[PDB]
Each structure stands twice: as C-alpha cells, then as structure tokens.
Design a protein around this ligand. Structure first.
Ligand SMILES: Cc1cc(C#N)cc(C)c1Oc1ccnc(NC2CCN(Cc3ccc(S(C)(=O)=O)cc3)CC2)n1
Lengths: 554, 398
C-alpha cells in the first residue's frame, strides 16, 4: 500500500534545476527486466507513466541469481536536492534500557515504497526505459512514492513513521516502541496474552496507515540479537567475540582486533588496546604482517583471559542511584565500571587520552570523570556518584592551586591502588641556603645549532652544545642541566614562559624525552623553586648566561 | 499586525548546530514549556524538510525557563539587526548613578515572525538514551534570544516608552536583546519608584549583579605594585617583570633604575633613590586609565579571565591584545563562580559599549559545556573559546 499520510514538501537547492541526465542504451535482457519490474510497480501506484513534456531524467540500471532488481542512479538528483534533518542523533545503549516483560520485533514491508512523495517533487524522479537500440521513444515514468537511493527517503520515512506512531504512543503510554529504519521494536510489562493483543492493535493501526507487518507466526523469538548486542530478559552482553589465533598478524587483522576489543570494552572490564594501537602507527600496507612486540603479546594475552569467561551487564532501574568507579591500569590508561547495586555493572569502559603535550594523573582522572559524566547524561539523563582512587586532600591541594577551573560532581575516595598522587610540589617562595641557577638557551635559526647553559650565585658556570634543536628545546635542556648538576634543594631562574608553564603545571608524563628527563629529576629533589625574568632587560644573572649562551651567532 | 521581511544575505546558510546532551529534569521541563507554546501557537512541530538546528537549554528561582542559544543565527543575521535595523547605544547609560535590568522578552510572543524566515529558528528537544526520535519545532513569533527580535520590536517599544521618556527626560532606557536597561541619577528610593512606574507602562501592552547596577562607581582594577619594608632579589625580579609587561600598555613606565640592582634570590638589596621615585611615578600611571586606547565600534570585544585562587577572579576587556578598555575583579565551586563572573562582565560590557565580549575561558570545553547551564541566569549567551591561561598573566593582575 501507499500511506494516506500527508506528503513532506521537498525543494531543490536554491540556484538548481532538476537533473537532465541522458539514459544510456541498455541490453535487451535489462530492458525486458525493467519493463516487467515497472509494470508491477505501476499497477501498485508506486510509479506513473509520463508525457514527453517532462524534461527531467535520471539513469536506470538492472542487475541480476534468478531475480532482477531495478537500480536507479540518483547521484545527480541527490546533488540537486535540499538537505534534510538528521534521521537519529545516536543509538540507544543497552545499559540505559529499562526491563520489559515481553518483546516483539516487527518489520515494515516495502518501507519507502509505502510512503508518498511530494506531488511538486515527483517530476524530478523521472526516468526512461530505453527502447531496443534507443531507436524509438522510451517508456517515461515518475515516482509517486519514496524512491530507493534518493537523499530524502530515510528522513521522510522516519518522520512519517513517527507521525503514524504518535496517536498509538499517546493511547498506550506504558508501551515502548523503538524505530530504526524498516524495523520496529515493541516492549511492554503486560503478560504474554495482553501483549500479543496490543501488538495486533498496533499492526492494525499501521495497516490503517498503509504499512504492512509480519504476522504472529513470522516474528523473532529466544535471546534477541540487536545492534551488536545480546539482549536477554534480565541481562545484556555484546555479541560473541572471536579473538583469532594467528601466527602472523596483518595491519587489517590488528585493525579488526582493536575494534572487537574496543567493542568488548563496553562490558568486559580491564580491556587494554594501547600496545596493539602502537603497532598501527607508521601507515603500512593493509596486507602487511606486523611482528607483535612483547608488550603487545602480553596485552593480547591479558585480553584473552578477560574474554575466556562470558561477562554480562544489568538493565537500568530509575529508582536506584548510579555509581561510577575509576581505576588507573597503567600510564595514561584508565578503566571504569558503572553500576547501581555493588558490582552488578550496567556498563564498562576505558579512557586513554593525551589532551595536550604534557599531563599528570590528577588532570587525567578529572578528564576521565568528565568523559563519564557526559556519557551518563546521554544514557541515563543524570550524573553518577563517583568513587575515585584519589585522596580528597590531594584533589583539594591540586584544584585550589591550579590556574584552570576544575569542578567534579559528588565523589568519594576509594582505596583501590594505584592511587592518584602529585609526584613533586614546586616551592611557593625562594629557598634559603640553596644555589640559584640562572639558565638560558639560544639556538641559531639557520645552522640549527643550540647552546644550553647556566651561571650560579655560587660561581659555577657550564655551557653545552646541541645539534638540530629549537629555542624551545635549548631553554628546556638548560633547566635539565641545572637539575642534573645541582643538589636536593635548587632555585632556577629562566626567561622562558614556555618552560615555566610546562613545569608549573606539575607534569608526571610527557610526549617529549627532555620533559620526562626533567620530570625524573624533579621527583628526586627535596625542594625546587622556579622563577621567571624578562629576557634582554639587563637583569643580574640573566645577562651573564645570555653572554656565554649567545656566543656562536645567537 | 503583519510580518517584517528577514534576510540572511544572498549567501550564508542557516544554523546547523548540534544539541548538547541534556539532563532528565531539563528535558521534561522543556516538553512542558513547548506543549504550552504549541497550544498558544508560538511554535509549531516540524518535518524533516527543515535541516536547520539551534541548541536549547532550560534555566531557572523554582520556575523553569527556556533558553535558546541563537549565537549562530545572530552571527548569520548580523546585516539585519545591526546595519539595516540597528538599536543605537547611549553613552549616558554608563554615567548614571543607578541602572536597572528588566526582562521584556514576553513582548516578542505577541508579534508574528516572517513565514520565509521561520525555518531558521528550528530546535530539538532530545530524548534520553536516543530512545525516541526527538521533538522538533520552529518559531511562529519573534523568538527570545534572537537579536532580530528587538530590532523588529524597537518601533513598538518606542510607542510604549514615549510617555515615560517625555515625563522623565533625564532617565535613559536602552534595549539590549530581551532586556531593558534603565538608568537615572535619582536617589535609590526615587529610582525604584520610577522603575515600578515603568513596569505599569509595560503591563498595558502586556509585560552577581545585585538589586541594581552602579556604573558611575565602576572603577578599573589598577596594576598593584607591592609596598615592601624589605626587598629581596626575587621581589625585584617579580616587580621588574610586572612593570615590563605594564610598559607594553601604559605609556611612561620605566624599569631602568630597578634593573640596575649574579645574586641569590633570597639576598636582600637596599631600595635606591631613583628606583624608589620610578616605583612611585609608575604607581601614579597605573591609577589612571590607559592613554591611547579607544573603543572601535567595528572591532570585536575580547575578554580574558584569570582564576586568582580563594574565590578571586581577575578580568580584562580589550579589542587589540593587552590594550585594556576595562580591568576588574569578581568575588561556591570553580564553575559556579566562573559563570557568575562571565555574566557580570557581559552585563558591564552591554552597559558601556552595547556589545557582548568573546570570552577566553580558563576551563576544559567539556566541563564548561556540562555545567554552565546549572548556574546561568541571563537571557543571553556571549561568544566563548577555551584557553590555557599563561601562568604569568595571573601574577601580573594580582
Ligand atoms: C532498543 C530496543 C531494542 C530491542 C530489541 N531487540 C527491543 C526494544 C523494545 C528496544 O527499545 C526499548 C526502549 C526502552 N526500554 C527497552 N527495554 C529493553 C530492555 C531489554 N529487554 C530485553 C528482553 C529480551 C527478551 C524478552 S522476551 C524473550 O521475554 O519477550 C523481554 C525483554 C528488551 C526491552 N527497550
């Protein structure tokens, strides 16, 4: 059938006219097949014969196997047609779904061909079946329904479906319907008998609106496989993950492995993909074999242990609170579980993101909390109560002193080691009885040669030569020198805000080797005081280093 | 009553902005508001033929209010509300003893919106866990938040205000978006009496911070130089650096003598004759406004904020970097305090120039996007970008 629902008004792009694409002469089998397919569609009112006056044309093709299918190439009309609103913003997560006693899966028959097209737009869908060797005029047809492959079909079908369902939804508020393409997922708390009746009421309401559905003897049964998940009555999991046993792994094999692991990480806790992702770096042939590192081999083995036993997830109960727990599972690696009743997980997840160049555990945990917060608002429309492996005092000392505004919702410390801590603290004021290292670095923009050095109040002086370095690098190598040649307590004066900014932020992990070498030094020290002075202002100490550092064109 | 034709320009398409995830309570509040607005004919449910989108939020006392983020639309409609139908800004507003802010957005609901423009006001009420398609609507009337609404209404606003303006020539009224800025040099009791008088005029026709604003008292936060009994090498270095960066803004700043004195940071150095004079002379320069800096009405206003710790926040408004048009300060949690500061700075920016500044926010995009709506109270939204505050700029501004 063709729904009695009012048509959605369609337009072409402002300065555009309909497609006028020439029909390529086709094979006799294809002409025969198209005529056959078209006559049956015309008789159903899907298409309608048109006069010679209509100037628009879209090419048609036929592909065969015993059945023949009509293939219209809407490439040009799609380019000329207006933009439509996005079909759906996202896909429901099983963890967000509430328990339903009974479930029925209904599929709409010939979906697009059951929805009318805007009368004013029909002319643009015009196509011609060529005559044998294009000798005589072909058979001209236009669509009356939503054509397959046209830009506006997914959007118009869903809105029509949403309009049709609206009265039923209002009349049955306790029934749940999920629309996805040609499919309809109906759920209710009613007992098997009462449910089967309401399904028929819906099918009848759908038929009243030109939409066919399969009868009670054609529907799906046992554990529902939906969108890559296994939906059981009181629990959910992801569809079975086959971690292949391979002696040799191609780029393609690793790419698929990672995807399957990332998919598994929604419910399987502790899944790691870092060392395997390191193998994907380098841009190599997709068929190219990559030798697995010991770190990747260890990671793959740890994942195989997690996946050896099937792990399930629970459904959402709006009456209970959401609890999110985070654990540090290595450097830059974070793992989380979300539950309502202790250790009966709704969902699982991981976070590993290097925001910027250098970072610390306190920043990483806050970013991990933020990622989970947004996720929780999507799935449940509310934030969870957090359980973090950081002391309230560590957090307080960090946030109050940090330049950035940081705010995390209701949380509690949980003693799940490794714990989040500040590896070193920089001094608030200068140190008495401590050597003051005035540092400087200058690299020749042309020769790329650099010079990093220091001058002290204790009289010490040192200058080192660097190959293929920037000024950013030399100023950093200068601070490393001061930390290398100093004792447990030190005062460091620099003219680099870049270096100051990095160090001031208390990093414990970095992309740069130099920064990690500096970090390693900062932890060893008992006291460190970092100060800044404006370069080339004739400041005592700064001017002294500048002299011995600028030597050799700088 | 008939529609005023609205144009975006021969080019420039409408807004296609993503809707940030909303909480359960905020979604529910929006469906209640929108059902009432649909019934009243203010908005209408839309089909997929409208590809446009503008974000919506729900803000607050106890009652929920709908807040539409028309930032992209306002940007795309600039020719209309600014050049074609611009509301002029009075220089007198900033000079008044007391300024009162009154919401007048309810006046736009009585005026119809150009049929051909309506599609650009499209918004979405999303569903939790993407379980339902998402309620789509568009406006039939002038929408609150859009800069085109007061531009069209100004003609009707002048008629409403005509008697009150005639009876009170020394009172200045400025229309900015959904609000009226009412300034007078009257005593607080008399000022409040005149506000209530104006409310009655609006009643016929159908209509941080504090009780009022005091822009005549809005003084700049001068760059403060420490007054010390004893000065260490480090103290001078901090003072040399602070004055060196101030010399980039304030014409006349000198460091020369202070620079004149390889030593340990902890070592004390006695304060010289010419350096003591230099310090006192610079102190007098920082007290007064920046010489050479003027507001360019064709240039965008930019605002920087620094978290000073202990509930303290510093800010600067400029058009050309570091050339300050205004500097100031603001005094439970980091985000709540920051939203309060943003609103306060925006309110001042409106009073002084008749424009909002683009904010350089010292916060992670995600954290702000999640929490700003929880504490926001204004009808408008300024432009914002997320920035990493340079460690020195915090120290230089106290
Ligand atoms: C997104 C989605 C996918 C499928 C499928 N496919 C079915 C539906 C109605 C669906 O949409 C929604 C919307 C709101 N809550 C729930 N609650 C769900 C919670 C999980 N149960 C699982 C379940 C599995 C079997 C049976 S049976 C074999 O007992 O009828 C009852 C419930 C399904 C509804 N599902």
């Amino acid at each position: 059938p063709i729904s009695p629902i009012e048509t959605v008004p369609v337009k072409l792009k402002p300065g555009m006219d309909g497609p006028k694409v020439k029909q390529w002469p086709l094979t006799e089998e294809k002409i025969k097949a198209l005529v056959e397919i078209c006559t049956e569609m015309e008789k159903e009112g899907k298409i309608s014969k048109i006069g010679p006056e209509n100037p628009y044309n879209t090419p048609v093709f036929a592909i065969k196997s015993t059945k023949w299918r009509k293939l219209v190439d809407f490439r040009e009309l799609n380019k000329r047609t207006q933009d439509f609103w996005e079909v759906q913003l996202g896909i429901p997560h099983p963890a967000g779904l509430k328990k339903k006693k009974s479930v029925t899966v209904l599929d709409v028959g010939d979906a697009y061909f059951s929805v009318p097209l805007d009368e004013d737009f029909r002319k643009y869908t015009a196509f011609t079946i060529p005559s044998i060797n294009n000798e005589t005029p072909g058979i001209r047809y236009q669509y009356n329904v939503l054509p397959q492959g046209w830009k506006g079909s997914p959007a118009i079908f869903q809105s029509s479906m949403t309009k049709i369902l609206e009265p039923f939804r209002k009349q049955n508020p306790d029934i749940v319907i999920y629309q996805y393409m040609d499919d309809l997922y109906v759920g209710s708390d009613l007992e098997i008998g009462q449910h089967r009746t309401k399904i028929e009421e819906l099918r009848q309401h759908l038929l009243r609106w030109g939409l066919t559905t399969p009868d009670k003897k054609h529907q799906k049964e046992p554990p529902f496989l939906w969108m890559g998940y296994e939906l059981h009555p009181d629990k959910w999991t992801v569809q079975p993950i086959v971690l292949p046993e391979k002696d040799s792994w191609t780029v393609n094999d690793i790419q698929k492995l990672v995807g399957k692991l990332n998919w598994a990480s929604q419910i399987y806790p502790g899944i790691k993909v870092r060392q395997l992702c390191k193998l994907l770096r380098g841009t190599k042939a997709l068929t190219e074999v990559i030798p697995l590192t010991e770190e990747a081999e260890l990671e793959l083995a740890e994942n195989r242990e997690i996946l050896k036993e099937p792990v399930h997830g629970v459904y959402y109960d709006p009456s209970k609170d959401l609890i999110a727990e985070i654990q540090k599972q290595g450097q830059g690696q974070w793992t989380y579980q979300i539950y309502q009743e202790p250790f009966k997980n709704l969902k699982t997840g991981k976070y590993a993101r290097m925001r910027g160049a250098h970072t610390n555990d306190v920043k990483q945990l806050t970013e991990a909390v933020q990622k989970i917060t947004t996720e929780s608002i999507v799935i449940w429309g509310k934030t969870p109560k957090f359980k973090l492996p950081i002391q309230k005092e560590t957090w307080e000392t960090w946030w109050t002193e940090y330049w950035q505004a940081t705010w995390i919702p209701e949380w509690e410390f949980v003693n799940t080691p490794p714990l989040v801590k500040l590896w070193y603290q920089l001094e608030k004021e200068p140190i008495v009885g401590a050597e003051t290292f005035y540092v400087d670095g200058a690299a020749n923009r042309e020769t790329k040669l650099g010079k990093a050095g220091y001058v002290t109040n204790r009289g010490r002086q040192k200058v080192v030569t660097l190959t293929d370095t920037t000024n950013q690098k030399t100023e950093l190598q200068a601070i490393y020198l001061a930390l290398q040649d100093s004792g447990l307590e030190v005062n460091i004066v620099t003219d680099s805000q870049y270096a100051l900014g990095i160090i001031q932020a208390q990093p414990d992990q970095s992309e740069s080797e130099l920064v990690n070498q500096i970090i390693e030094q900062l932890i060893k020290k008992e006291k460190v005081y970092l100060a800044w002075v404006p370069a080339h202002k004739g400041i005592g100490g700064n001017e002294q280093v500048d002299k011995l550092v600028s030597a050799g064109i700088r | 009553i008939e529609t005023v034709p609205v144009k975006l320009k021969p080019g420039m398409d409408g807004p296609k902005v993503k809707q940030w995830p909303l909480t359960e309570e905020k979604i529910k509040a929006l469906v209640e508001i929108c059902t009432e607005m649909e019934k009243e004919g203010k908005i209408s449910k839309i089909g997929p033929e409208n590809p446009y989108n503008t974000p919506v939020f729900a803000i607050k006392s106890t009652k929920w209010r709908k807040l539409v983020d028309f930032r992209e639309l306002n940007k795309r409609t600039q020719d209309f509300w600014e050049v074609q139908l611009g509301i002029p800004h009075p220089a007198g507003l900033k000079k008044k003893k007391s300024v009162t802010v009154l919401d007048v957005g309810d006046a736009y609901f009585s005026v119809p919106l150009d049929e051909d423009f309506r599609k650009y006001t499209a918004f979405t009420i999303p569903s939790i866990n993407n379980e339902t398609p998402g309620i789509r609507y568009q406006y039939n009337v002038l929408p609150q938040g859009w800069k085109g609404s007061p531009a069209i209404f100004q003609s009707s606003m002048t008629k409403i205000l005509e008697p009150f303006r005639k009876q009170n020539p020394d009172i200045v009224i400025y229309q900015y978006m959904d609000d009226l800025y009412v300034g007078s040099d009257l005593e607080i009791g008399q000022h409040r009496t005149k506000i209530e008088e104006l409310r009655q005029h609006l009643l016929r026709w159908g209509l941080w911070m504090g009780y009022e604003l005091h822009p005549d008292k809005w003084t700049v936060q001068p760059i403060v130089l420490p007054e010390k009994d004893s000065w260490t090498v480090n103290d001078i270095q901090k003072l040399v650096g602070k004055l060196n960066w101030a010399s980039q803004i304030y014409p006349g700043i000198k460091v020369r003598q202070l620079c004149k004195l390889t030593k340990a940071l902890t070592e004390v150095i006695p304060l010289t004759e010419e350096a003591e004079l230099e310090l006192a002379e610079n102190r007098e320069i920082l007290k007064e406004p920046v010489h050479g800096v003027y507001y360019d009405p064709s240039k965008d206003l930019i605002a920087e904020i620094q978290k000073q710790g202990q509930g303290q926040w510093t800010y600067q408004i400029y058009q050309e970097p570091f050339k300050n048009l205004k500097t100031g300060k603001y005094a439970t949690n980091d985000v709540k305090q920051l939203t309060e500061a943003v609103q306060k700075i925006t309110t001042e920016s409106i009073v002084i120039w008749g424009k909002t500044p683009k904010f350089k926010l010292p916060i992670q995009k995600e954290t702000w996007e999640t929490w700003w709506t929880e504490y926001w109270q204004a009808t408008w939204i300024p432009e914002w970008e997320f920035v990493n505050t340079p460690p020195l700029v915090k120290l230089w501004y106290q």
